[PDB]
Amino acid sequence: PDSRNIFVSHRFPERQVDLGEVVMNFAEAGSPDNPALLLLPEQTGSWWSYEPVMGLLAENFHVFAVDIRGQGRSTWTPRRYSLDNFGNDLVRFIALVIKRPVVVAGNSSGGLLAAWLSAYAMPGQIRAALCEDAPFFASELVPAYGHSVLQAAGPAFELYRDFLGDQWSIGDWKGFVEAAKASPAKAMQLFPTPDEAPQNLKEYDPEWGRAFFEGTVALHCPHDRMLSQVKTPILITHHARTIDPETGELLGALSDLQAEHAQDIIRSAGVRVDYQSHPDALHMMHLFDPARYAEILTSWSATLPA
Amino acid sequence: RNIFVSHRFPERQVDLGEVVMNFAEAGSPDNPALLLLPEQTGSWWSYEPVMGLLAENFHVFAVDIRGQGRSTWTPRRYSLDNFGNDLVRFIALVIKRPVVVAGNSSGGLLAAWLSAYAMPGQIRAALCEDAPFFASELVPAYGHSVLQAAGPAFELYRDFLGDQWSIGDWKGFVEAAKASPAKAMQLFPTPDEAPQNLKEYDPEWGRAFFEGTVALHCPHDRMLSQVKTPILITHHARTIDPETGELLGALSDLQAEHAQDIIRSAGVRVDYQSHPDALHMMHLFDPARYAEILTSWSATLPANDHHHH
Ligand SMILES: C[C@H]1CCCC(=O)CCC/C=C/c2cc(O)cc(O)c2C(=O)N1
Ligand SMILES: C[C@H]1CCCC(=O)CCC/C=C/c2cc(O)cc(O)c2C(=O)N1
């Protein structure tokens, strides 16, 4: 994987654009007369996390699915992984490639960035943001509310750092898998441990995981302040989540309490916010139940002002 | 936040999205565009005495960086990357042409930031006026850290003025400054009343430098390795105290030598001028000299003719 020559074929053509520091890879679907839709993957996911759902969304949207920096065919940038750098790359992407206002939809950390764009993009760039099971608060080191990253997804990111290493400099996949299987963190059960590293992980810069676990990725983007600054309608979907009865760990993206405060803050900013709890859905609904995801996204987007 | 004073160039503001950025414009768009970045604690009008000279030959934009002047104060969001992307947006939304960027001190850091990290084609060239490469980092690759240079002053901005002037203990700041063991404290204003520039300054800037958060995600050795335009480095007064080892000045000879080396190994044009008797803010305290440095160097840039009309 530190070859950066490990890529495979996909169903939609891919194109790259120079944003200045990062060269961003992306795939396009749908017809350009339809409203623009920017799709942001989960951490460890390339644009083609959205490949099964892109055909469905192609019926109604002009779809751009991107590799975020440090993922896929987009530039890996050591020591530069922050929500602000991720977000400003996407501001540049809209300005250089799309050149229209977008609906932005993001899963997990991509949902953090969907909110980031609502608050901090260039004026007019963002019509609305869909935050698909975004770990508001629970992906911070010291959140204003609820479980920290250390008490939720952190243990997996720690193992990415310790065994895969920055830019796959260590690459001990077998040691990662044996450490993951031996971990006493119940949340580890939500992460794949196949016999060989899966394609999405070979495209992933594990310094992402370091930055989340060490609390550097969002040091300059406290979530309570970010959510208070959003400027567009927001849709929050909230998928599976439980509190482990033996460790107290959060299993899922964010707890009910965290979701309640996220809504409250957005509402206090005076922007439209809608919340949908889908407690039996998997974290990556856009991948594992694309028809349900597409319906949610399409139906909501139809309620947006023109 | 209503302590502003008049100035001899009209000021305007532009919404960048998060930051509303204040700036002063002078000159004709027929001449090359020039973006002026102040030092930390300096508003755009740090350049007000020299802009008349520069407006003879340049279309000048002098800006208030986020957390300074009339530009939005943004609690907890002070980083070189956020400062830098604001300026990327400013060029894209206001200037709409390639620019020469000239910055003093932290503004010089940001000029190099733009050279490396702006959108393609935005930056023609960067003038880094006594920029504290390495010396303004918490863990620099080379030489003094901020803790052995300007840090003690920023520490006192944090401790006595506070984030967004939330403490505001100017008297106690002055008293602590005078009592400081740091020889470098003599380089900072300690008047009996807070000066105008500092009333316009968000001291969380100082916190961010002292605590090593402002450039956590922008190590300077890597930044300098990624520059993509010609760079002019001016290096003004500096000495290293023989008793404490403190750096008095923006950067040491060792730090300037590595900065040059790194830029040159990026394969771009780099020029270095040592002005060991110049004050840190030469653009303010020796404006005629500074204007001649910038103008004469700009005239040697490729496409200087294309940018005249
Ligand atoms: C890798 C991606 C895969 C999801 C693995 C899980 O289903 C665990 C529960 C959901 C939380 C994930 C999660 C937390 C976080 O604090 C930061 C992140 O980027 C994610 C994030 O993107 N996970
Ligand atoms: C306040 C402004 C003016 C104070 C200048 C001095 O006379 C001290 C000399 C060294 C440079 C300061 C300096 C260091 C740094 O690590 C980061 C910075 O932004 C400055 C910076 O902009 N100083």
XYZ file of C-alpha atoms in Angstrom, chain B:
309
model
C -15.510 45.273 19.483
C -15.992 48.968 18.489
C -12.574 50.479 19.209
C -11.569 51.212 15.603
C -9.953 54.423 14.334
C -9.911 56.257 11.018
C -7.490 55.571 8.176
C -6.464 57.227 4.941
C -7.534 54.322 2.690
C -11.201 53.242 2.657
C -11.886 49.877 4.216
C -14.276 47.223 2.941
C -15.297 43.786 4.183
C -15.965 40.538 2.323
C -17.733 37.393 3.532
C -15.378 34.459 3.082
C -17.928 32.064 4.622
C -16.741 31.810 8.222
C -14.597 34.927 8.429
C -15.743 38.341 7.293
C -12.411 39.873 6.227
C -11.645 43.575 6.339
C -9.169 45.072 3.874
C -7.933 48.322 2.377
C -7.351 48.671 -1.388
C -5.095 51.131 -3.212
C -3.808 51.600 -6.722
C -4.912 50.688 -10.206
C -5.767 47.183 -11.429
C -3.554 47.922 -14.414
C -0.566 47.136 -12.171
C 0.341 43.778 -10.620
C -1.820 42.678 -7.706
C -0.060 42.706 -4.304
C -1.463 41.140 -1.116
C 0.026 42.475 2.145
C -0.086 40.308 5.271
C 0.613 41.934 8.689
C 2.664 40.662 11.604
C 0.936 39.095 14.596
C -0.903 41.841 16.605
C -0.831 44.031 13.454
C -3.878 45.091 11.470
C -3.767 45.936 7.773
C -2.742 49.484 8.641
C 0.611 48.195 9.817
C 1.129 48.882 6.093
C -0.670 52.232 5.963
C 2.504 54.394 5.855
C 4.000 52.300 3.027
C 0.919 51.613 0.877
C 1.023 55.009 -0.859
C 4.533 54.159 -2.051
C 3.470 50.680 -3.176
C 0.244 51.858 -4.848
C 2.433 53.695 -7.377
C 3.396 50.341 -8.912
C 0.967 47.751 -7.525
C -2.750 47.086 -7.081
C -2.486 46.758 -3.304
C -4.715 44.787 -0.942
C -3.833 44.985 2.756
C -5.885 42.638 4.927
C -6.862 42.071 8.542
C -6.192 38.389 9.190
C -8.784 36.430 11.174
C -8.520 37.340 14.851
C -7.234 40.869 14.076
C -8.596 44.298 13.266
C -12.117 44.329 11.909
C -11.939 40.702 10.706
C -13.950 38.090 12.531
C -12.521 36.772 15.805
C -12.899 32.946 15.738
C -12.434 31.289 19.142
C -10.543 27.951 19.116
C -9.943 28.111 15.318
C -6.526 29.786 15.149
C -4.237 27.699 12.918
C -1.956 28.534 9.997
C -4.192 26.401 7.771
C -7.319 28.377 8.708
C -5.487 31.704 8.311
C -4.180 30.491 4.985
C -7.436 29.229 3.563
C -9.091 32.534 4.432
C -6.484 34.221 2.224
C -7.083 31.658 -0.546
C -10.767 32.649 -0.432
C -9.935 36.334 -0.371
C -7.859 36.049 -3.552
C -10.548 33.981 -5.230
C -13.476 36.236 -4.215
C -11.923 39.748 -4.234
C -8.715 39.922 -6.220
C -9.448 37.324 -8.952
C -5.898 37.557 -10.352
C -2.536 35.991 -9.510
C -0.820 37.892 -6.700
C 2.526 38.656 -5.269
C 2.106 38.061 -1.525
C 4.304 39.899 0.988
C 4.020 39.148 4.698
C 5.796 40.187 7.899
C 6.549 37.709 10.703
C 3.557 35.325 10.979
C 2.272 36.982 7.808
C 5.538 35.861 6.208
C 4.819 32.341 7.387
C 1.480 32.697 5.625
C 3.078 34.005 2.430
C 5.138 30.810 2.318
C 1.967 28.871 3.232
C 0.260 30.309 0.146
C 3.269 29.592 -2.063
C 2.930 25.932 -1.091
C -0.770 25.440 -0.422
C -2.880 28.012 -2.343
C -5.104 27.024 -5.250
C -3.234 26.532 -8.534
C -2.055 29.738 -10.138
C -3.134 32.057 -7.306
C 0.400 32.914 -6.160
C 3.131 34.345 -8.407
C 5.771 34.790 -5.684
C 6.107 35.285 -1.937
C 8.064 37.851 0.041
C 8.697 36.612 3.583
C 9.693 39.658 5.634
C 11.582 38.532 8.751
C 9.384 35.438 9.089
C 10.053 33.222 12.137
C 10.607 29.953 10.322
C 11.217 27.241 12.938
C 11.515 29.773 15.790
C 7.711 30.108 15.911
C 7.214 26.336 16.197
C 6.928 24.394 19.429
C 9.118 21.538 18.090
C 11.040 22.989 15.136
C 13.223 20.844 12.955
C 16.130 23.250 13.579
C 17.252 25.698 16.226
C 15.284 27.603 18.837
C 11.704 26.719 19.602
C 9.153 29.421 20.327
C 9.814 28.716 24.011
C 13.326 30.177 23.603
C 12.267 33.089 21.362
C 8.968 35.044 21.266
C 7.095 32.566 23.470
C 7.339 34.330 26.841
C 5.525 37.346 25.417
C 2.718 35.186 23.976
C 2.488 33.407 27.310
C 1.773 36.734 28.986
C -0.771 37.755 26.330
C -2.563 34.527 27.207
C -2.177 34.790 30.953
C -3.120 38.462 31.389
C -5.165 39.481 28.345
C -6.880 36.149 27.708
C -8.730 34.608 24.799
C -10.792 37.333 23.064
C -9.604 39.820 25.727
C -11.629 37.889 28.343
C -9.200 38.737 31.172
C -8.044 42.160 29.971
C -5.476 42.766 32.752
C -3.234 45.194 30.873
C -1.675 46.502 34.088
C -0.711 43.006 35.163
C 0.594 42.206 31.700
C 2.913 45.216 31.873
C 4.061 44.295 35.400
C 4.735 40.662 34.454
C 6.557 41.753 31.288
C 8.913 44.027 33.209
C 9.598 41.296 35.759
C 10.225 38.585 33.147
C 13.585 36.728 33.072
C 13.263 36.471 29.292
C 15.690 38.860 27.592
C 13.365 38.668 24.571
C 10.606 40.457 26.503
C 12.355 43.750 25.739
C 11.289 43.398 22.091
C 7.556 43.821 22.982
C 5.582 47.054 23.671
C 4.872 47.611 27.398
C 3.196 51.064 27.441
C 0.913 52.182 30.237
C -2.190 51.797 28.048
C -2.895 48.984 25.610
C -1.914 50.231 22.129
C -4.450 50.452 19.326
C -3.047 47.489 17.397
C -3.345 45.257 20.461
C -6.888 46.352 21.232
C -7.641 45.044 17.713
C -5.873 41.721 18.429
C -7.390 38.483 19.733
C -4.810 37.182 22.271
C -5.843 33.607 21.578
C -3.404 34.104 18.699
C -0.674 34.263 21.329
C -2.017 31.225 23.159
C -1.951 29.269 19.904
C 1.715 30.090 19.239
C 2.875 29.477 22.822
C 0.988 26.171 23.159
C 2.138 24.828 19.790
C -1.330 24.469 18.330
C -1.168 27.129 15.613
C 1.230 25.118 13.418
C 0.664 21.611 14.794
C -0.646 20.608 11.334
C 1.866 22.765 9.414
C 5.425 21.748 10.321
C 7.665 24.354 8.743
C 10.246 22.003 7.249
C 7.524 20.224 5.307
C 5.804 23.490 4.329
C 9.009 24.973 2.922
C 9.652 21.761 0.984
C 6.283 22.255 -0.769
C 6.621 25.887 -1.950
C 5.868 26.325 -5.669
C 6.826 29.970 -6.394
C 9.919 32.156 -6.100
C 10.538 33.203 -2.507
C 12.320 36.295 -1.165
C 13.525 35.955 2.441
C 14.519 39.134 4.243
C 16.345 38.522 7.525
C 16.460 41.549 9.820
C 18.086 41.954 13.254
C 18.845 38.845 15.276
C 21.149 37.968 18.135
C 21.386 35.033 20.498
C 21.835 36.017 24.112
C 25.120 34.573 25.467
C 23.675 34.021 28.958
C 20.207 32.563 28.309
C 20.644 31.453 24.714
C 17.404 33.234 23.812
C 16.775 34.271 20.230
C 16.095 37.993 20.071
C 14.594 38.421 16.630
C 12.464 36.425 14.224
C 14.847 33.614 13.297
C 18.486 32.651 13.716
C 21.207 32.402 11.083
C 21.023 28.619 11.391
C 17.249 28.669 10.852
C 17.513 31.003 7.858
C 20.192 28.811 6.299
C 18.012 25.674 6.563
C 14.963 27.544 5.258
C 16.977 28.532 2.183
C 18.360 25.021 1.769
C 14.905 23.468 1.938
C 13.358 25.916 -0.513
C 16.211 25.505 -2.937
C 15.845 21.728 -2.764
C 12.180 22.190 -3.764
C 13.645 23.497 -7.032
C 12.205 27.029 -6.873
C 13.956 30.377 -7.022
C 14.948 31.623 -3.578
C 16.614 34.931 -2.761
C 17.978 35.866 0.658
C 18.793 39.398 1.906
C 20.343 39.923 5.339
C 19.551 43.346 6.856
C 21.030 42.881 10.341
C 20.366 46.465 11.427
C 16.734 46.541 10.240
C 13.834 46.516 12.696
C 11.475 43.553 12.623
C 8.632 45.482 10.948
C 10.716 47.196 8.286
C 7.608 47.891 6.168
C 6.427 50.199 9.012
C 9.652 51.573 10.522
C 11.727 51.913 7.308
C 8.973 52.077 4.662
C 11.100 53.574 1.884
C 13.663 50.759 2.187
C 11.001 48.064 2.288
C 9.139 49.461 -0.733
C 12.415 49.449 -2.730
C 13.223 45.848 -1.739
C 9.759 44.602 -2.750
C 9.468 46.669 -5.926
C 12.969 45.894 -7.216
C 12.501 42.177 -6.533
C 9.036 42.107 -8.115
C 10.466 43.653 -11.292
C 12.666 40.526 -11.665
C 9.746 38.143 -11.592
C 8.636 36.304 -14.740
C 5.378 37.684 -16.181
C 5.907 41.097 -14.563
C 5.018 42.429 -18.031
C 1.916 40.209 -18.418
C 0.604 41.692 -15.168
C 0.802 45.244 -16.472
C -1.990 46.415 -18.776
